[PDB]
Design an enzyme around this catalytic site. Structure first.
Site, PDB file in Angstrom:
ATOM      1  N   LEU A  46      -8.187  -7.282  21.692  1.00 33.18           N
ATOM      2  CA  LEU A  46      -8.434  -8.722  21.714  1.00 33.18           C
ATOM      3  C   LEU A  46      -9.309  -9.097  22.898  1.00 33.18           C
ATOM      4  CD1 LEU A  46      -4.811  -9.862  20.841  1.00 33.18           C
ATOM      5  CD2 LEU A  46      -6.822 -10.522  19.504  1.00 33.18           C
ATOM      6  N   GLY A  47      -9.064  -8.462  24.048  1.00 31.29           N
ATOM      7  CA  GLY A  47      -9.852  -8.724  25.245  1.00 31.29           C
ATOM      8  C   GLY A  47      -9.471  -7.807  26.399  1.00 31.29           C
ATOM      9  N   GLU A  48     -10.184  -7.911  27.518  1.00 32.17           N
ATOM     10  CA  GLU A  48      -9.867  -7.099  28.698  1.00 32.17           C
ATOM     11  C   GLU A  48     -10.409  -7.689  29.994  1.00 32.17           C
ATOM     12  OE1 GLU A  48     -12.225  -3.413  27.369  1.00 32.17           O
ATOM     13  OE2 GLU A  48     -12.935  -3.604  29.415  1.00 32.17           O
ATOM     14  N   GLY A  49      -9.774  -7.301  31.095  1.00 32.14           N
ATOM     15  CA  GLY A  49     -10.253  -7.608  32.427  1.00 32.14           C
ATOM     16  C   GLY A  49     -10.579  -6.300  33.127  1.00 32.14           C
TER      17      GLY A  49
ATOM     18  N   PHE B 184      -8.681  -4.647  35.161  1.00 32.23           N
ATOM     19  CA  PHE B 184      -7.513  -3.785  35.359  1.00 32.23           C
ATOM     20  C   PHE B 184      -6.617  -3.670  34.127  1.00 32.23           C
ATOM     21  CE2 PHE B 184      -8.163  -5.341  39.852  1.00 32.23           C
ATOM     22  CZ  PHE B 184      -8.743  -4.164  40.280  1.00 32.23           C
ATOM     23  N   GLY B 185      -6.901  -4.456  33.091  1.00 28.48           N
ATOM     24  CA  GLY B 185      -6.052  -4.458  31.913  1.00 28.48           C
ATOM     25  C   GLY B 185      -6.762  -4.741  30.599  1.00 28.48           C
ATOM     26  N   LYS B 186      -6.182  -4.235  29.510  1.00 25.88           N
ATOM     27  CA  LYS B 186      -6.665  -4.444  28.146  1.00 25.88           C
ATOM     28  C   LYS B 186      -5.556  -5.108  27.348  1.00 25.88           C
ATOM     29  CE  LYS B 186      -9.065   0.044  27.691  1.00 25.88           C
ATOM     30  NZ  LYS B 186      -8.029   1.045  28.126  1.00 25.88           N
TER      31      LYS B 186
ATOM     32  N   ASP C 230      -2.709 -19.956  41.338  1.00 23.57           N
ATOM     33  CA  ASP C 230      -3.937 -19.847  40.548  1.00 23.57           C
ATOM     34  C   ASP C 230      -3.806 -20.632  39.256  1.00 23.57           C
ATOM     35  OD1 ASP C 230      -6.557 -19.130  39.855  1.00 23.57           O
ATOM     36  OD2 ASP C 230      -6.014 -17.085  39.236  1.00 23.57           O
TER      37      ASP C 230
ATOM     38  N   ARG D 163      -7.986 -21.746  32.544  1.00 20.80           N
ATOM     39  CA  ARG D 163      -8.242 -20.358  32.172  1.00 20.80           C
ATOM     40  C   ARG D 163      -6.950 -19.537  32.179  1.00 20.80           C
ATOM     41  NH1 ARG D 163     -10.242 -21.079  37.127  1.00 20.80           N
ATOM     42  NH2 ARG D 163      -9.051 -20.107  38.826  1.00 20.80           N
ATOM     43  N   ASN D 164      -5.926 -20.008  32.887  1.00 20.03           N
ATOM     44  CA  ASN D 164      -4.685 -19.244  32.977  1.00 20.03           C
ATOM     45  C   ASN D 164      -3.573 -19.805  32.108  1.00 20.03           C
ATOM     46  OD1 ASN D 164      -5.123 -16.961  34.606  1.00 20.03           O
ATOM     47  ND2 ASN D 164      -5.227 -18.242  36.452  1.00 20.03           N
TER      48      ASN D 164
ATOM     49  N   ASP E 256      -0.846 -16.259  33.796  1.00 24.59           N
ATOM     50  CA  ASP E 256      -1.632 -15.822  34.945  1.00 24.59           C
ATOM     51  C   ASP E 256      -2.265 -14.505  34.544  1.00 24.59           C
ATOM     52  OD1 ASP E 256      -2.774 -15.131  37.390  1.00 24.59           O
ATOM     53  OD2 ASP E 256      -0.915 -15.337  38.524  1.00 24.59           O
TER      54      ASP E 256
HETATM   55  C1  LIG Z   1      -0.004 -13.868  28.953  1.00 23.80           C
HETATM   56  C2  LIG Z   1      -0.709 -12.675  29.620  1.00 23.80           C
HETATM   57  C3  LIG Z   1      -1.576 -11.738  28.816  1.00 23.80           C
HETATM   58  C4  LIG Z   1      -2.321 -10.553  29.424  1.00 23.80           C
HETATM   59  C5  LIG Z   1      -2.135 -10.282  30.899  1.00 23.80           C
HETATM   60  C6  LIG Z   1      -1.247 -11.192  31.721  1.00 23.80           C
HETATM   61  C7  LIG Z   1      -0.531 -12.366  31.072  1.00 23.80           C
HETATM   62  C8  LIG Z   1       0.283 -13.245  31.974  1.00 23.80           C
HETATM   63  O1  LIG Z   1       0.140 -14.452  31.891  1.00 23.80           O
HETATM   64  N1  LIG Z   1       1.095 -12.603  32.935  1.00 23.80           N
HETATM   65  C9  LIG Z   1       1.822 -13.355  33.898  1.00 23.80           C
HETATM   66  C10 LIG Z   1       1.996 -12.657  35.221  1.00 23.80           C
HETATM   67  C11 LIG Z   1       2.730 -13.349  36.349  1.00 23.80           C
HETATM   68  C12 LIG Z   1       2.899 -12.619  37.704  1.00 23.80           C
HETATM   69  N2  LIG Z   1       1.860 -12.856  38.390  1.00 23.80           N
HETATM   70  C13 LIG Z   1       2.179 -13.332  39.660  1.00 23.80           C
HETATM   71  C14 LIG Z   1       1.334 -12.760  40.791  1.00 23.80           C
HETATM   72  N3  LIG Z   1       0.015 -12.592  40.377  1.00 23.80           N
HETATM   73  C15 LIG Z   1      -0.815 -12.177  41.524  1.00 23.80           C
HETATM   74  C16 LIG Z   1      -0.071 -11.620  39.399  1.00 23.80           C
HETATM   75  C17 LIG Z   1       0.920 -11.828  38.255  1.00 23.80           C
HETATM   76  C18 LIG Z   1       3.268 -14.758  36.136  1.00 23.80           C
HETATM   77  C19 LIG Z   1       3.084 -15.454  34.796  1.00 23.80           C
HETATM   78  C20 LIG Z   1       3.632 -16.865  34.624  1.00 23.80           C
HETATM   79  C21 LIG Z   1       2.945 -17.860  35.543  1.00 23.80           C
HETATM   80  C22 LIG Z   1       4.355 -17.382  35.849  1.00 23.80           C
HETATM   81  C23 LIG Z   1       2.349 -14.760  33.659  1.00 23.80           C
HETATM   82  O2  LIG Z   1      -2.777  -9.194  31.551  1.00 23.80           O
HETATM   83  C24 LIG Z   1      -4.080  -8.914  31.025  1.00 23.80           C
HETATM   84  C25 LIG Z   1      -5.185  -9.633  31.846  1.00 23.80           C
HETATM   85  C26 LIG Z   1      -6.536  -8.984  31.407  1.00 23.80           C
HETATM   86  C27 LIG Z   1      -7.455 -10.055  30.746  1.00 23.80           C
HETATM   87  C28 LIG Z   1      -6.753 -10.596  29.450  1.00 23.80           C
HETATM   88  C29 LIG Z   1      -7.547 -10.065  28.230  1.00 23.80           C
HETATM   89  C30 LIG Z   1      -8.028 -11.313  27.428  1.00 23.80           C
HETATM   90  N4  LIG Z   1      -6.903 -11.863  26.704  1.00 23.80           N
HETATM   91  C31 LIG Z   1      -6.929 -11.822  25.264  1.00 23.80           C
HETATM   92  O3  LIG Z   1      -7.868 -11.309  24.666  1.00 23.80           O
HETATM   93  C32 LIG Z   1      -5.732 -12.420  24.529  1.00 23.80           C
HETATM   94  C33 LIG Z   1      -5.857 -13.000  23.190  1.00 23.80           C
HETATM   95  C34 LIG Z   1      -4.698 -13.566  22.547  1.00 23.80           C
HETATM   96  C35 LIG Z   1      -3.356 -13.545  23.274  1.00 23.80           C
HETATM   97  N5  LIG Z   1      -2.084 -13.978  22.955  1.00 23.80           N
HETATM   98  C36 LIG Z   1      -1.234 -13.706  23.998  1.00 23.80           C
HETATM   99  C37 LIG Z   1      -2.025 -13.077  24.955  1.00 23.80           C
HETATM  100  N6  LIG Z   1      -3.282 -12.998  24.525  1.00 23.80           N
HETATM  101  N7  LIG Z   1      -4.476 -12.413  25.206  1.00 23.80           N
HETATM  102  C38 LIG Z   1      -1.753 -12.519  26.299  1.00 23.80           C
HETATM  103  C39 LIG Z   1      -1.672 -12.122  27.375  1.00 23.80           C
END
Ligand SMILES: Cc1c2cc(cc1C(=O)Nc1cc(CN3CCN(C)CC3)cc(C3CC3)c1)OCCCCCCCNC(=O)c1ccc3ncc(n3n1)C#C2
Length: 296
Positions: free
Chosen positions: A17-20, A22-24, A151, A155-156, A169
């Site tokens: 679906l997507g990536e950054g 450090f993660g996919k 943050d 976008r988040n 996030d």
């Molecule tokens: C939903 C999600 C997806 C993918 C991720 C991360 C997350 C997420 O929110 N995590 C997260 C973490 C914390 C901890 N936090 C604190 C300290 N910080 C310094 C760090 C981390 C806190 C919170 C809540 C705010 C309290 C949430 O990781 C992948 C990131 C790589 C880029 C994303 C790729 C593009 N995304 C997509 O292509 C896509 C498309 C549809 C879809 N549906 C659900 C999701 N989703 N993603 C997801 C996710």
């Protein structure tokens, strides 16, 4: 330790679906997850590196996400740590992040932009307020737990079918949002455009700095996703913020909604409205009858 676990066999990857950096993230079927749904779609996040540090950050995110589960926080179903790769399983949110969603239903949107979920054309006042209200409710919950986000930005946030908006996030390492961060050498990155004077100047981040950031998110919403201080370089943005300049009222923002932004942007942190008061205000407007909103 307290995290729900999902067996690897129950996850079937479909496509990315997507990536950054450090993660996919993959779309996947997950079965025997929810009883009424023998097979559902989920979003599965996998790491793009190994050895020790990221694996610590994996289980850190997991325990945190489990603790913070709430109706307008991104929904987390658990982990698969049965061998490698390590997987995190999230609720799938079809409209992706809120900034993308806002830009695809902006001032130039027309009939084509409409769908099963959302009206054609630019999001109406009612819908913009409904989005704002949901994000504020999430922030109310996090303030309740004394979790400082640091943050908060559209976008988040994620947007699911039904236009359910939830706070997440994604970190700071998606190429598409690299411009939303000011990189300080190797320290590393700061979302300055969303940060209050006391964060920029004194490096303090509190619940009150989150209210400021929510003020900026509210501005994002009513400008359909445009970047705050878009006309400014990073250093010019820092100058403007620290000197007390304020984002101007969006064209689509009524004076009363602007009053709420400015209440988030009080220079002195203690003079800022509480997020619960901001939410109360926004929810009232979101739920107000058309007759009221039409002359708002
Ligand atoms: C939903 C999600 C997806 C993918 C991720 C991360 C997350 C997420 O929110 N995590 C997260 C973490 C914390 C901890 N936090 C604190 C300290 N910080 C310094 C760090 C981390 C806190 C919170 C809540 C705010 C309290 C949430 O990781 C992948 C990131 C790589 C880029 C994303 C790729 C593009 N995304 C997509 O292509 C896509 C498309 C549809 C879809 N549906 C659900 C999701 N989703 N993603 C997801 C996710």
């Amino acid at each position: 330790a307290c995290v729900h676990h999902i067996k690897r066999r129950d996850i079937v990857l479909k496509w990315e679906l997507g990536e950054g950096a450090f993660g996919k993230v993959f779309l996947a079927e997950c079965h025997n997850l929810l009883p009424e749904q023998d097979k559902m779609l989920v979003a599965v996040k996998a790491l793009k590196e190994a050895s020790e540090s990221a694996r610590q950050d994996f289980q850190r995110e997991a325990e945190l996400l489990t603790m913070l589960q709430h109706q307008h926080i991104v929904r987390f179903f658990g982990v698969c740590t049965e061998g490698r790769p390590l997987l995190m399983v999230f609720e799938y949110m079809r409209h992706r992040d809120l900034n993308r969603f806002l830009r695809s239903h902006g001032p130039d949107a027309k009939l084509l932009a409409g769908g099963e979920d959302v009206a054609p054309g630019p999001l109406g006042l009612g819908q913009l307020l409904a989005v704002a209200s949901q994000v504020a409710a999430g922030m109310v919950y996090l303030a309740g737990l004394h979790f400082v986000h640091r943050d908060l930005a559209t976008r988040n946030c994620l947007v699911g079918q039904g236009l359910v908006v939830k706070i997440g996030d994604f970190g700071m390492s998606r190429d598409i949002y690299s411009t939303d961060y000011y990189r300080v050498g190797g320290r590393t990155m700061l979302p300055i455009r969303w940060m209050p004077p006391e964060s920029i100047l004194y490096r303090k981040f509190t619940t009150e700095s989150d209210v400021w950031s929510f003020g900026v998110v509210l501005w994002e919403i009513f400008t359909y996703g445009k970047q705050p201080w878009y006309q400014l370089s990073n250093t010019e943005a820092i100058d403007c913020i620290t000197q007390g300049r304020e984002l101007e009222r969006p064209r689509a923002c009524p004076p009363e909604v602007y009053a709420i932004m400015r209440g988030c942007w009080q220079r002195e942190p203690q003079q800022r409205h509480s997020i619960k008061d901001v939410h109360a205000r926004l929810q009232a407007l979101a739920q107000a009858p058309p007759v009221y909103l039409d002359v708002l």
